[PDB]
Amino acid sequence: SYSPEPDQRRTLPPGWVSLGRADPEEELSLTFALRQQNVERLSELVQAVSDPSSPQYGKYLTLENVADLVRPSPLTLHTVQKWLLAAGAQKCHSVITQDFLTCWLSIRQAELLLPGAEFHHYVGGPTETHVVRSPHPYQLPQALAPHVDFVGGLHRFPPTSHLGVTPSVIRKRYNLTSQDVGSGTSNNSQACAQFLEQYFHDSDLAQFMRLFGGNFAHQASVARVVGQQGRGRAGIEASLDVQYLMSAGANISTWVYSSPGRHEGQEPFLQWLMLLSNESALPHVHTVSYGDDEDSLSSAYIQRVNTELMKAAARGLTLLFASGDSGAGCWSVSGRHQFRPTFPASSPYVTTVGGTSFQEPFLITNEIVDYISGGGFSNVFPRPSYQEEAVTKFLSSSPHLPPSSYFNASGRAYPDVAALSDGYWVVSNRVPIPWVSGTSASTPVFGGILSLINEHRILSGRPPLGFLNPRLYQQHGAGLFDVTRGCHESCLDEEVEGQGFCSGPGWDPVTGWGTPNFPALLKTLLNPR
Amino acid sequence: SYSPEPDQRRTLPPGWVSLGRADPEEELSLTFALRQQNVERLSELVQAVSDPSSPQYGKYLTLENVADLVRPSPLTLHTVQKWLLAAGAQKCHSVITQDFLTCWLSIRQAELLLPGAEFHHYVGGPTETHVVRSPHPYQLPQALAPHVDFVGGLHRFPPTSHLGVTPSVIRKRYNLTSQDVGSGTSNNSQACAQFLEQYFHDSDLAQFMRLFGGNFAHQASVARVVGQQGRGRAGIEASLDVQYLMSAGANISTWVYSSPGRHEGQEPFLQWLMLLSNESALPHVHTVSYGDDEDSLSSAYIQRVNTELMKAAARGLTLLFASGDSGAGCWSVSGRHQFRPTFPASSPYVTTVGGTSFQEPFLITNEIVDYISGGGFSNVFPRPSYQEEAVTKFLSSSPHLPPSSYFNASGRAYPDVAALSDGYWVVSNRVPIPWVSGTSASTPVFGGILSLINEHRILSGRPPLGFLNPRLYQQHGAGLFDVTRGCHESCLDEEVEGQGFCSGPGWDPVTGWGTPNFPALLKTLLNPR
């Protein structure tokens, strides 16, 4: 037989208590990632539709278009089924793109179905979510190697984790006016997704807005919540996402994605991806907080996720991801240290958002790099051509360039952009919390400002921004305040003594093109083209 | 009811697995620290005997003098024995100084003995090591308050933790000559103490000396081994301390203390400290690698250990401690960050050794601080007068002085001296290991050199150096190579950013007075006073 993910890290993360081996008769939800077809063609379409110097720019594909393009062959669907029918797979659902299948099997059924699998069960977090996973690798029978990419639910665990920043601070700094807000009578909407075991509360948002929202028109509440369950206790990550999205993109209808699938033995991020391909009418802008160490991921997983991201860009969705909170990172290989890039941040098909900080203790005059701001170079995805200019420029001109031992210069470099990541006020469990920091903060801020620009485009005769990056780089980041001072963190060692890459004049791998000066951005991204 | 140690950290350290609640009938070994007399007298005696401007300089107490001085009152001896007898404490061992008492007790009896104690058991680290400890606080009947300092074995867990550096290299750099070795027919001896689950093997020492001992006279084996009752695997640390002590202080009779007491419910370091006070004829120089975060320790424990360190100084023992391997450290107190001192390193009655590295890849011309070199300011012990001048110079004249928020200027500053800590070759389990780093490396190197100086003194009829610091500081550290470039590590935060104190032209809290230039050192410490 065949082992599709031999390179998937299977080790138990910290914060997870191991219950023993799993009960034969105990159930499990596996999600089978079915072989797609015209992937190469999709990659061409994405570029045709998102490069502005291309006649098809903005001529986005409907979900239906995407499904006609990418859906598995009839041999795939038939073979995967039946094969699943036997082995007892019970009531399953697919999606529109029909390239995913989630079923219910008893573990002893799954264990025979996926030889090598040996399910244990765990409980983890501050909160405590249940999973069923296998610390041993699995195989598919050789038969359906060309029909299944991987099986979700086997190894990857869900995530576990100056002056104070206020909405007014953000609007002042990014030159948002009291009027620079949504005229919510179009179909423009925005979303944030988050995958911890937290709940966002309607009440906390209302409280937040009462305290902070006086000087701008704002939506009372969330338009829609996807993936809710029961009664909850709020956490700061779930609150920050929504509270700041709805402040940076003020009077705009907002959807919230609340760790889909999690309450079950499922991969939340995978489930959210799956969900994107099961509804045709989606928000134009999505801000996401999610990452793994790039090196921990199987090639099959990492490549397939990248394809799902491609499918998003084809539909004119603009996807933003936090660049991470560990700087360049730190990875000890053989017997050395390297930087440690992160993923879905390292994906070429996403807008990755870095972290910024105030320069002086008491003033908001200027932005400097925030120490924690994730950035770097992929070990998996080659430099996309859209950044060829900016990246080579950085490599050839940077004085504080780290030893090339620590990274791969040929890889997709990131982040793409940045915003304040330091010292946010959030409301959670009806209490205000002072000094919340992270690139999870900057991603929704950048997101909402983008979503606001989408309104000016669609109210006009124009299509949404979609996959922004090619335009962004093409226009030399124009519009964004260019962050020039500071470096992010890395390994506590002798070579690279706590220091990763540094910010410099052009684009850089700590803050991208820098930070959103709304008026300037508007202009540039509203130019005809 | 009295709580003598409410300020002792009781939390489980990492690398420890909790078994259940301990069985009542399960025996257990407790070590009772008995109330001492005349501690302030002991203090005066130390200064009289260690201050080179004293006419009592070098006139050391005998162990029996110390015992006569310090022993508990007859009231305490009687009251403690009635008390233990009735608790069921089975046959007990004391020491010569009569201020320690180790007994065997049922767990059940320990619990009555000490209301509040609830005993759990745990297994250790890379070595499966057994302890029995209480996660809850314990108290003593009010009647015993005057008579008992504390009970050992209740909360503190044992420890779990560019060219190569060779004996050759060390001898070259510290200007040791092939003749600068021990003429082993006096009673001069030296010793190392280590507290991990590791054994040192004679074979490895022989192998080490065969490979590196080529061009200096050396001793075949360890003269004596205290604390070992079987076989095992050699550990890197146990190997390092012994191998480099016998190279720096070559052809000198050498004793190894091997984690005394560990194979029971005993605190190895405490147990080692007891043994000191149970043998009259001891080696003059002791090199010790042991450390806890200072703040983790109860007042009663930390003050008492300091006293035992005073007993050792009074007897003309030279005690050396590694300064630690996390620079200034990092401590998140309330909502803040401070440096994190270590102890016994912070004790004013010990000689603390920091860490050095070679500047260039291929040459031994110059030393630089080793990033990991422990140092700082005590929050417990105040600056001793012997270092008033040096610390004041450093405080007043250092540029790169960290935020004063991070430390306490009025505390015992350390390290006092330094030696190479980077890139040691060791033989462990008959295999040579290349890159052994640490301040546990530098301590034996310093100690060995000191022990050679003792030989020159004793031959020619002078006293041992004993507790060295007063003389060392008084003579402005001279005969040590003064280290001046580099800083040690600290918090990865936005106010300090991985950097602690920095080295400077004189004494500093990263390398002390610096590095042992033998000829010069010889000259100053062998001359008059």
Ligand SMILES: [Ca+2]
């Ligand atoms: Ca820049």
Ligand SMILES: [Ca+2]
């Ligand atoms: Ca110095």
Ligand SMILES: [Cl-]
């Ligand atoms: Cl346009």
Ligand SMILES: [Cl-]
């Ligand atoms: Cl003398």
Ligand SMILES: [Zn+2]
């Ligand atoms: Zn197994």
Ligand SMILES: [Zn+2]
């Ligand atoms: Zn279960």
Ligand SMILES: [Zn+2]
């Ligand atoms: Zn800050």
Ligand SMILES: [Zn+2]
């Ligand atoms: Zn250009």
Ligand SMILES: [Zn+2]
């Ligand atoms: Zn309890």
Ligand SMILES: [Zn+2]
């Ligand atoms: Zn036990």
Ligand SMILES: [Zn+2]
């Ligand atoms: Zn080194």
Ligand SMILES: [Zn+2]
């Ligand atoms: Zn002086």
